[PDB]
Design a binder for this molecule. Structure first.
Ligand code: SF4
Ligand code: SF4
Ligand code: FES
Ligand code: FES
Ligand SMILES: [Fe+2]
Ligand SMILES: [Fe+2]
Lengths: 633, 633
């Protein structure tokens, strides 16, 4: 099972699944081998009914699409559509939050409110929305309207791009025509330009992709902004992770998907229903997180993380998961079928994300508490139905310190320098105690033994004094392997990095260091990493493509991860991807993405499947940046 | 060559291409065989980096996607993305026209103006925009703003759906949640819901598809509305079609793509440059049309159609095509390479639609005349470079009577009944002189011998007294085979239909019938057919799903054709498709699309590759509708 997942709790559940004849993602992957080499290389096109078209990577015919589409066009069109799809997910999420905020302040959704007034005001100020002598509700209404306005063309470009990146960066991007006009506008334009008989120049197509990736960035940043206003900006919190956070004597409820609009209410209502749960013979309702929405409630409330990404089915295999409450994105639809074997009640809540065989309970923001109670009562009923049934919860969990929003990080640093909080970080970059910064982001992928890339690369970087920050299922991987436990600083961290983590931790009253890796939150909260890096850029008076900062989507899966990787490149970062995106069938496209894009944005992809080699390449990228700033490395 | 195209001019050019070693779409198709059966059936998914996934249509593993996505989910997601892509094209086109109208009336694009004031006012009235005591420029500004507003969420749904279909139809669609909230909104929502781990219920996914198809309808209708305001509502016009419309002694300039914003100016400026062209040794500039933008200028100005869709390369093979002026959509990128052999100057004009190797001349509406002149001067230079070179223009063309906008049709009918113009049409439906109405729409497809389905089905329906209307490359097929020549009425038409065409024609001063098939314009002008059918529905006090009206995308290719077929189904029409869309890998999806959707919208797909059988099925559909209305059949 170690060949499938490096997580021992997951290995234990794989054995149980095998024993019980429950097919898993790894089994479905095995059944899929060998996968289609045209698809793998990107040399397939189904954009019209003359297809499917393919191009032999090497050899003889077919060499070109039926319409004349070259390998470089077909590869760039496929990639662009993946970016658009990612953008559509992150921005759909953000749009949902924008409508919820609007409803809240118009009196239509009393379960929601402005929880972070300071965040609201700072966002308003960043957007140019006056606050002076204005009601919070009116400021919030204006912020919500601005959010919604960024989805379409108007007299300004997308403000959730132009107001969050330094002017110098916006200038470089504007010069290449890369600033998005509107989020859904760009998504639609990608789908148009990649449809048959339209855009057929690789460079032109890829530039459209870069621009659509910035529309994804805007959706991410908007999502984080709005979730913070509504639900609170995260601060350091201590919790736990892995399957051992499930409790046989509790009603175990997983929140799974992405949007805190749902999970946040689940969390608060679950506390209100403790006595009902105990009436049913449970100790209480034990809310646990899966995927991003688990990250959202972990960051804000310390809700323990059950599992992530590829291993999500394993939570069910325990026999103790009474409910899995879904909104959208990254939910393996297998869960609806597995539920029949495991007894878990899988509940969908969003009109556009249903799964055949799951129970659908519409969740309206206007009736959030009522709908939450309905959902949680299904969970309590399920708990009762497993009275007397043995469960197998692996007794495996890690301690997780998380909640490192950019505000939280700035606050932590301010204990070392009150009026110049970034300076201690920069001081230690300059003196070599911090070599650079690496953001781990994105998914697990069944092709990579689960977590192997994240942990292998993180271990090498931490020993080389890289400050490691993490989001999404990257943060999930690292938390499950102990990288968010400060007790592991001595083992994992180089002396320089240890010194800094310890210094900041001791200044914050901990008597101990910050954790080895800083959990910056969900995938939309990759925007937090952008906020930090942009604040560092502004403080140094240089652009992001001069900073010793890199990203690694070390086990990427979702179209969202492709969009995130692409905007990381577009904002100026060397960006590692540890799975093959479908680009290798075109050398020219690969060359643009891994090399010539440096001349456009300063960032570039690093495609490297071997994690030890990936680490070396990321370190080289970091050190090149150090050299560029005249620093020793 | 008859196995490739039924068009003799195309056959002649195929022989020339073969002789000269110029690879064509048919050669690239042959080189692609056998095509991938997973793609053909829809049983392939590349929506994440765990893929590519496939499902054996029959047999053993793989039976399910890696994430657990079933055949029915994978098929419905693929289809939905095609609908979104189609919607993105038609609506991008419409958006372009909306911005042009806005610029025109704000004084920023003096080459454009309100040409059809009556159309402007009627659209304003339909949208609820007051005109009483308003300047045309201000009304137009409000119409342009309303157009742009339909792309995003607002306090009203998409008005270019809700104001163009009868209330009863809007009610049925609203009841199923099918009315689009915003055009780009829906496009984005499709891309989201079809991304990994989101929507995973075939019925739910397909309903999203139906709704996105109505967003495509809105883009089509908006495009037609705006093009009419800007460039004039078509009226009956006589012209010619096929390769024989090229002239060895003229500068031959093809307008190819979709948007009249470009081609309309090309047409007017070309007339202004006659003396320059003659200075270069040409008789003049001979503008000819390819694809929809050719249809636009044919409908409004009588510009002859050179060719369409699959055979577009053949115009170049003549040796006489001096320029091919492109905007976007349906342009085989092969043209850029073929140009090198044929001498043709291929010119792209839109930022989001470039082709490697083509000359790009940016076309700004603000500088339309200047940019048009630059483009046409490249054409004149090219004409000069072929002085003394033999050309082979097949001496093959047909007479085409076209320009049958819905207003034109209503006007024609009004000569028989001034104050109830639809009544003569309905009278003849009731008495059996007109059996029903069939709209031919959409593309040619290299898989079908070019035009074979259109002409085979049209011939059978016309003999059975079906009133045949046509748009896009369906209209192209039929025009090239003589179906738009009134001299062919005796040969093609049943006695009943002949009687009616003759009656209307003689009432309109022709001394002869209307043509066998009524050309209703470009693909966005499928919206004109909707206007006619909706006016008939309103006049009869019944919904569209009770009318003896069917559609046939007999040789469909583009994602746009899939979107159009899907909205034809959604508005209540039996809708034939003569190529296999990638749905056969899921029986449940096929069953929904061909059967159970009847219970939702009253329309349904008829998938039938055999054109004689397709004709029989369309006739059966028509006659079933007749029976439903209590009429003999
Ligand atoms: S768009 Fe071109 S390459 Fe793609 S399926 Fe159609 S003919 Fe083939
Ligand atoms: S979304 Fe599911 S079926 Fe599609 S490629 Fe990814 S794992 Fe395979
Ligand atoms: S030929 Fe396998 S992905 Fe299309
Ligand atoms: S396996 Fe051929 S279309 Fe994907
Ligand atoms: Fe996520
Ligand atoms: Fe078209």
């Amino acid at each position: 099972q170690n060949l499938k997942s490096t997580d021992r709790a997951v290995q234990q559940m794989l054995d149980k699944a095998k024993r019980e004849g429950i097919q898993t993602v790894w089994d479905r992957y095995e059944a899929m081998k060998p996968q289609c080499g045209f698809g793998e290389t990107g040399l397939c096109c189904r954009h019209c009914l003359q297809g499917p078209c393919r191009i032999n990577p090497f050899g003889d015919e077919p060499k070109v699409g039926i319409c004349g589409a070259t390998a470089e066009v077909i590869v760039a069109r496929g990639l662009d559509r993946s970016i658009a799809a990612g953008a559509a997910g992150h921005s759909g999420h953000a749009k949902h939050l924008a409508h919820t905020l609007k409803k809240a302040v118009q009196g239509k959704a009393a379960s929601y409110m402005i929880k972070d007034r300071t965040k609201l005001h700072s966002i308003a100020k960043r957007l140019g929305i006056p606050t002076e002598g204005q009601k919070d509700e009116d400021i919030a209404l204006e912020v919500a309207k601005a959010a919604l306005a960024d989805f379409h063309e108007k007299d300004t470009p997308v403000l959730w791009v132009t107001t969050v990146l330094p002017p110098s960066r916006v200038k470089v991007l504007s010069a290449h025509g890369l600033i998005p006009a509107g989020i859904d506008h760009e998504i639609a334009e990608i789908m148009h330009r990649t449809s048959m008989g339209c855009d057929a120049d690789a460079q032109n197509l890829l530039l459209g992709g870069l621009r659509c990736s910035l529309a994804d960035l805007a959706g991410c940043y908007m999502g984080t902004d709005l979730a913070d206003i509504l639900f609170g900006t995260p601060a350091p919190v201590v919790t736990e992770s892995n399957l051992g956070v499930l409790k046989a004597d509790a009603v175990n409820v997983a929140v799974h998907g992405h949007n805190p609009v749902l999970s946040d209410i689940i969390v608060s209502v679950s506390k209100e229903m403790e006595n009902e749960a105990r009436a049913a013979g449970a100790t209480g309702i034990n809310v646990v997180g899966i995927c991003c929405t688990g990250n959202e409630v972990l960051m804000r409330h310390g809700i323990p993380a059950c599992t992530h990404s590829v291993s999500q089915e394993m939570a069910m295999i325990t026999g103790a998961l009474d409910a899995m409450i879904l909104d959208y994105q990254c939910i393996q639809p297998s869960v609806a079928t597995i539920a029949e074997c495991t007894g878990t009640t899988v509940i969908t809540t969003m009109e556009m994300s249903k799964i055949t065989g799951a129970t659908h309970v519409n969740f309206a923001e206007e009736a959030a508490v009522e709908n939450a109670k309905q959902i949680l009562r299904l969970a309590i009923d399920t708990f009762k139905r497993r009275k007397g049934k043995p469960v197998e919860i692996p007794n495996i969990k890690t301690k997780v310190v998380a909640g490192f929003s950019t505000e939280a990080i700035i606050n932590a640093l301010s204990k070392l320098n009150a009026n110049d909080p970034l300076k201690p970080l920069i001081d230690n970059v300059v003196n070599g105690n911090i070599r650079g910064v690496c953001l781990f982001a994105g998914c697990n992928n069944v092709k990579v033994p689960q977590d192997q890339n994240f942990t292998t690369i993180a271990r090498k970087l931490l020993k080389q004094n890289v400050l490691v920050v993490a989001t999404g299922c990257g943060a999930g991987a690292l938390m499950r392997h102990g990288f968010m436990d400060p007790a592991n600083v001595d083992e994992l961290c180089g002396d320089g990095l240890k010194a800094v983590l310890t210094a900041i931790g001791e200044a914050n009253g901990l008597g101990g260091p910050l954790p080895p890796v800083l959990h910056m939150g969900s995938c939309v909260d990759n925007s937090r990493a952008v906020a930090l890096v942009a604040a560092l850029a502004n403080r140094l008076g240089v652009d992001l493509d001069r900073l010793p900062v890199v990203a690694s989507a070390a086990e990427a899966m979702h179209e969202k991860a492709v969009a995130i990787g692409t905007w990381a490149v577009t904002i100026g970062l060397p960006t590692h991807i540890g799975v093959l995106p479908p680009i290798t069938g075109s050398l020219p496209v690969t060359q643009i993405l891994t090399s010539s894009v440096k001349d456009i944005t300063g960032g570039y992809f690093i495609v490297e499947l071997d994690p030890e080699t990936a680490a070396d390449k990321l370190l080289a990228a970091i050190n090149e940046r150090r050299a560029g700033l005249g620093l020793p490395w």
